[PDB]
Each structure stands twice: as structure tokens, then as C-alpha cells.
């Protein structure tokens, strides 16, 4: 009975790739060429921050495009004023091991979470002049990978086992559960239109998830190792995946195929984080070779190195309008290029 | 000397800096002990002797506060979250020492110590712990010495060539995994031969970390 099941399995698997094979027309390089490259473009650090005591893991921008949040190994979540370097306030955590921090679009709430398979949500705009734990979702047995607010009331989280969960703030019960990937999940990016999202897994698989329907819309297979970072295009109909094999790749939702591969023979070590900017023109990537490359999405060639970090780059980010670019690495400093 | 807003917003940085620099030296007085090795075998009982997700245990003696990172129920990939524990002073590995005599096996007709060896080789050659000295505990000494008489050790492994005495048979298998070390210069392996009736089974590791501490200082100043 299992033989026919397996046979139909490879038949269905071969059906999909045959459809994908006939869909491709031409490489992205041949259509993105014949235009002037950006050239050598790098800038000094206009601001430089301090205060952290250990390696930072995650940090997120704001809707106001000025305020910032940051999280490190030590149990501190610090709020930054980028223009004038003064710390707005700090929030003590309960677990040192944290990998996820996020800033709500309205600015009222922040989200944190690490190796304890829980997601805490604190309230910023409090009448009593403090920051209090609004909610604490606990529905996983593992470790959180990425947190991205969908609205003031809906939050999507990626668990470390195999799954993702769309939650409700008022009641800790999960609204929806997405299963698959047959392995751990590392990165979770959410669309600007707040209707779709993707996830990167340790099994070289990326799956589109429908927010309302709750079923896997598409599945992407690529790279020979783990996937650590992913981020939507500002248009919202594409994404980029960073992998442990020292190579990034570009994917389009409707194309369902690879478009561009970014790699360099000088580096052999993998990518820790990836991020975009305004107009989707500069793909910034933070590696663990102590540097932080900045390459054009259309042309994979190098366009600038933001060297100046004493350890491996962990985080990234860009302003909503596209003005400045923050960073952050395993050295406690958190620079803000512009 | 700026406007009224900034003259009161540059004092927020002052208090946050004083809180951060005050709470950043309070956590630098504690030692961090990883237990990437098996702990559910017999180390739970040891935890109960001193006094799902990451299990943080806090204890103290001789003016040193120890943070034991019991990673027991993670049940995920051991390579993704292993760099988070880089920088710990020591890694407590544990062996029940009651498997060759018992022939418990159950790993698909494979003795458990082959898996234990495999784990020790995986952890002792890891890139993140090249400067960290493993500290090995061996438990269930009384049971092993009481049921080693009737148990044929050579049947499990023909490489052994010795008598059935408890104080010479066990020494053969130590090199099996100790010789697997690829860097004998700094990654020393310690042993204590703990017992369940033993009363002083933690003092050992304390001495051990002192050997790791003082030598580490000699790396900084440069006496070596």
C-alpha cells in the first residue's frame, strides 16, 4: 500500500517542477543590465550608540521613522532616540536568551521572545508612566524565531519546532496554526499590506502562508543549507532569502522561481541578516565576516561595505521613508549610518 | 544649553546610562556552566543534591554564583542555538557508568556508550568550545561495582583485555573518548567518579573552574 503512495508522491513532485521549468523565460541579469550602476557608495557613521553590555540579537525601527528599539543577551530592551542620542527608557526582561523583538505600528506595544517558547508583549503608552507586560502568549514547546506585528490586535509568530501561529492579543488562544517545513523555522517576514507572510526553515524550504485561509499557498526550495533571514520587497510581491552557505537569493511570489543569486568567492561564511530600503534598490546584508555588504538587487555586484564592527553583524533595518540605515553586531555598539 | 525640551531630554540618557552600567556589573560576578551533554541520566539527582525550554538553575558556594544552563527539553537542532552559550566557563558532561555491566543498549541493538562517545566527539571538537574545558562526571558507582562481577565486558567490545576488577576495567574505556580530543593543549577533560551516596560531588567542579580561572588570567597578563 505504501509503494503506490510513494510512487504518486514522486509523480506529484515531478509535476510541479516540470510546470516551474516551463515558466522561466530569461535570467534577471539580462533584463536588469544596460543601465548605470550605483557605483562606489559608502558613508561614514553619522551617529553611534552605546550602553549595551553584551551581544545584541534583534532591533526594530518605528513608524515615526525616528524612534528605535533594541534587544541584547542581557535582559534589557532599550528604546533609542536616533536624532539626539538619548535613551528614552529601558525595559527589563525575564529571560536573557532572546532572539525576537518588534515595535508595533501604532507605537503602543513592543514584543519580545527567545528560547523559552513564549512571546511577551509590553505596553509603552501607559497612563501611569511605565512599561507593563500587556500579554504573554505561551503555546509553543521550543524557541521563537521571529515576531512581526500584523495590526494592533493580530500578531504572527514563528516557532522553533516546525510551525507558525497567528494569535489574538485579548485571548492567548491561537487564531490559526500553520504546519509544515518538516523542521525548524528561523525567519519570518510579514507583508506591508498585512495579508500574507513567508517563513524560512532549516530544511531549505520557504512557504507562503495565507493569513485568512490558513493553508500553504506556495512552497519554495533552494539553497543547500539553513535559511536564517528573509524580508519582503517594499512592493510586497517578492522576498530575499539569506542562507548559511554564504549566498543570498531572490524570489518572486507569482514567478515561483529563482531570479538572482548573490555570492562572493572571497567570503565563505554565511549570512546572519538581510534587509531592504526604499524603492527596493539597495539590498543590505549583515554577514559574520565582521562586515556588512550593500549590493544592488538588480545587479549583484558590490556597491559598498559598512566596515567598522568588531564582531559579526546580527541586525539591520531602514527607515520608513528611506533616510537612514541602522545596524548592530555582536559587539555591544549599535551604529546608525546615514 | 538647548531648548527646554532638550535640556530635560539629555538627562534621560544620564539615568539610563547609570542604570545600564549599574546592572551590567552585577551580572559579571557569576559563572555560567553549560550542560550540552546528557543530564537526564543521573545529573538530575545531582541537581537535587546541591539543595518546555531552557532550564536555568542558580546556586552558590565559596562566594561564587553558578548559573547552570540545563538544556534538557529543547528537542530541536543542537547547532542553531549553540553559539548563544559561547563564552561559558565549563561544560558539565555526565555518564551513568552503568551500561556495559547492565547492557541496557536499546538503541537498535547498539550500546548506549557508542552514542555517548559520539556526543563527546561532537562536543569536544566544536568550534565554539575550543577554549572551554569539559568536566566529566560518572555516576552510579555503587551499582556498577556491585553488578560488574557477573557482567562480561569483552562480549560488548573485544578490544578490551583485562580482568573483572572494578578498579582496572573502567579505566580502559576512558581513553576511548579522551583520545578523541584533537586539541590536548587547552581542552583538558576532568573526572570525579561521583556516587549517589557521595556527599561532596560538587566541590570537585568548583576546584575545576578555579584551574580554568587562574590559567585564563595567565592568558591575559602573559605569564605563559
Amino acid at each position, epitope marked *: 500500500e505504501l509503494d503506490q503512495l510513494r510512487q504518486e508522491a514522486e509523480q506529484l513532485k515531478n509535476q510541479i517542477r516540470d510546470a516551474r521549468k516551463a515558466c522561466a523565460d530569461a535570467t534577471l541579469s539580462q533584463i536588469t543590465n544596460n543601465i548605470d550602476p550605483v557605483g562606489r557608495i559608502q558613508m561614514r557613521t553619522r551617529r553611534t550608540l552605546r550602553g549595551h553590555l553584551a551581544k545584541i540579537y534583534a532591533m526594530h525601527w518605528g513608524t*515615526d521613522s*525616528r*524612534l528605535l528599539v533594541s534587544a541584547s543577551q542581557d535582559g534589557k530592551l532599550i528604546i533609542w*532616540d536616533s*536624532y539626539t542620542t538619548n535613551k*528614552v*527608557h529601558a525595559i527589563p526582561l525575564r529571560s536573557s536568551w532572546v532572539m525576537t523583538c518588534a515595535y508595533a505600528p501604532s*507605537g503602543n506595544y513592543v514584543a519580545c521572545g527567545g528560547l523559552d517558547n513564549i512571546c511577551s508583549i509590553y505596553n509603552l503608552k501607559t*497612563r*501611569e*508612566g*511605565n512599561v507593563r507586560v500587556s500579554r504573554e502568549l505561551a503555546g509553543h514547546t521550543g524557541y521563537l524565531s521571529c515576531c512581526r506585528f500584523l495590526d494592533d490586535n493580530q500578531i504572527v509568530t514563528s516557532s522553533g519546532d516546525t510551525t507558525c501561529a497567528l494569535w489574538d492579543i485579548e485571548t492567548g488562544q491561537q487564531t490559526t496554526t500553520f504546519t509544515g517545513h518538516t523542521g525548524d523555522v528561523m525567519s519570518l517576514s510579514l507583508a506591508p499590506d498585512t495579508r500574507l507572510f513567508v517563513s524560512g526553515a532549516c530544511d531549505a524550504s520557504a512557504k507562503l502562508w495565507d493569513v485568512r485561509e490558513g493553508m500553504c499557498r506556495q512552497t519554495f526550495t533552494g539553497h543547500e543549507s539553513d535559511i536564517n533571514a528573509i524580508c519582503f520587497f517594499p512592493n510586497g510581491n517578492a522576498f530575499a532569502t539569506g542562507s548559511d552557505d554564504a549566498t543570498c537569493r531572490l524570489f518572486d511570489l507569482r514567478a515561483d522561481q529563482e531570479l538572482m543569486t548573490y555570492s562572493h568567492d572571497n567570503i565563505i561564511c554565511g549570512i546572519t541578516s538581510v534587509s531592504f530600503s526604499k524603492s527596493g534598490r539597495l539590498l543590505l546584508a549583515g554577514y559574520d565576516d565582521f562586515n556588512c555588504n550593500v549590493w544592488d538587487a538588480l545587479k549583484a555586484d558590490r556597491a559598498g561595505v559598512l566596515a567598522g564592527h568588531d564582531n559579526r553583524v546580527s541586525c539591520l533595518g531602514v527607515t520608513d521613508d528611506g533616510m537612514a540605515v541602522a545596524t548592530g553586531s555582536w559587539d555591544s555598539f549599535l551604529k546608525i549610518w546615514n | 544649553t*538647548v*531648548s*527646554a*525640551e*532638550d*535640556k*530635560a*531630554a539629555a*538627562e*534621560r540618557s*544620564k*539615568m539610563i546610562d547609570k542604570n545600564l552600567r549599574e546592572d551590567g556589573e552585577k551580572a559579571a560576578r557569576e559563572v555560567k556552566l553549560l550542560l550540552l551533554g546528557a543530564g537526564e541520566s543521573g545529573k538530575n539527582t545531582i541537581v537535587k543534591q546541591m539543595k518546555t525550554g531552557i532550564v536555568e538553575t542558580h546556586f552558590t558556594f565559596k562566594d561564587l554564583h553558578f548559573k547552570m544552563f540545563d538544556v534538557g527539553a529543547q528537542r530541536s537542532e543542537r547547532k542553531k542555538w549553540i553559539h548563544c552559550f559561547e563564552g561559558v566557563t565549563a561544560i558539565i558532561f555526565c555518564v551513568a557508568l552503568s551500561a556495559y555491566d547492565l547492557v541496557l543498549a536499546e538503541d537498535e541493538e547498539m550500546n548506549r556508550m557508542h552514542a555517548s562517545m559520539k556526543l563527546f566527539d561532537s562536543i569536544c571538537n566544536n568550534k565554539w568550545f575550543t577554549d572551554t574545558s569539559i568536566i566529566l562526571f560518572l555516576n552510579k558507582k555503587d551499582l556498577f561495582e556491585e553488578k560488574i562481577t557477573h557482567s562480561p565486558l569483552t562480549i560488548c567490545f573485544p578490544e578490551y583485555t583485562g580482568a573483572n576488577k572494578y578498579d582496572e576495567a573502567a579505566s580502559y574505556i576512558q581513553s576511548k573518548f579522551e583520545d578523541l580530543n584533537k586539541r590536548k593543549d587547552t581542552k583538558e577533560i576532568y573526572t570525579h567518579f561521583t556516587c549517589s551516596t557521595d556527599t561532596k560531588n560538587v566541590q570537585f567542579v568548583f576546584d575545576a573552574v578555579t584551574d580554568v580561572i587562574i590559567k585564563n588570567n595567565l592568558k591575559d597578563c602573559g605569564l605563559f
Partner: single-chain antibody
Amino acid sequence: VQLVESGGGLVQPGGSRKLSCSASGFAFSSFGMHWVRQAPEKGLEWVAYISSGSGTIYYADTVKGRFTISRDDPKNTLFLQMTSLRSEDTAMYYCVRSIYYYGSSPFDFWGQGTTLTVSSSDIVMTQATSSVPVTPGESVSISCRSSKSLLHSNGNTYLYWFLQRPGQSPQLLIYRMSNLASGVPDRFSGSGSGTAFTLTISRLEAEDVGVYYCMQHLEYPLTFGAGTKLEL
């Protein structure tokens, strides 16, 4: 959320006295402590200040060497001590705590205040109207002017549009740039154009009618303009 104010009665000049305020059931360890004095015929003026950590104390134009703020949150001892009291000090006092962030709402909440009877280069703004008679059912539009440039190089102009309902305590309407405050109906509005500032009330009710005041102060001394009490 609430203030417990201690102080009041009849005194004589030259006698030191302390006026205290407590914010029990409310975090206040990081709040500035503006103190405000009431003129029965004129606008409120700021008389004393202290910042978070007790590392900064300010004073008004003609009060140096006369007031002193003492703040100690462990024992909830938060008060003003009077030095060299003079006869012309028959007035009432408010205690307003506020702290400054980016995107914050300075002066968002106000205290209750207490009266006190005594035996018998400053920036000045101009009120368009004063002592206007009260009339229900009429929309209110009030204009104000500033002596100097409102726009600081940081881009944070000072546009305070405090409102006072007939009663005990006032409320804020506009703090920085035409932005509404907390605990206030949406019927109110504010706007500015150059040196011309405007307060607008379209819908009227039993609580919409009140007194209005404005601040625009780049320097330490804070003082309202002429009183625009509709009830007068």
C-alpha cells in the same frame, strides 16, 4: 491619576511655609515638577521647577532666592519651601508633573491645587480678546500673537493651549503642534500660522465653555497671557 495636595490657609509675610503634593498610586520617579500660580485677573505663571533626579532647578523672572523645590520619592516627600515671603502672595497654586520624550505629551495631566491668603528680555504674548462675556451656543475662535520666532532650530515649536473648565483644575488642548491631549473631547481644536495662533471650539455644551490660555516660551520663564475668562 490623582494628587493629594497639602497647604493652604491664611499666613503673614516673612513666614516660611511648605506646600506639598503626593502622587500615590502613580509612578512619579521620573517626572518634572512644574509649579503654577493663579492670578485672579491675569493668566497663570510658572514659579518653580525640578527635573528627574533632582539635578536641575529653575526659577521664574523675579523669584530667584525665594522658592525652593525639595523632592525625595522614597518617602513621597515632594514639596515647595517658601523663603522671604512677601505680603503680595494671596493666590492659588497648581502642581503639574510632566516629563519630556520624543513624541511625548508634555503637561498632559494636571493637579488639583490649593489656595493661600497672605495678609495685606522676557517673552510676552498678546491676547486678541480678554474678559469676553459668556454666551452659550456660539462657536469660540480665539487668536494669539508671539513676540519672537516660534520655530526653534529643532523644529519643536512651543504651542500650549491650556483650557480651564469652570471648576477646580484645567486641562490641555494643544501641546506642540495642533495635537489633541488625553482626557478631552474631540470638539476642541487648535491651529497656528506664523506668529498667529488659534483656538477653535465648534460644538458647544455645558462643559465646552471655559477659560483659555496659551504659552510659547523658548526660555525658562513660563507665563500665560491676559486672562480670557468667558465667565467674566
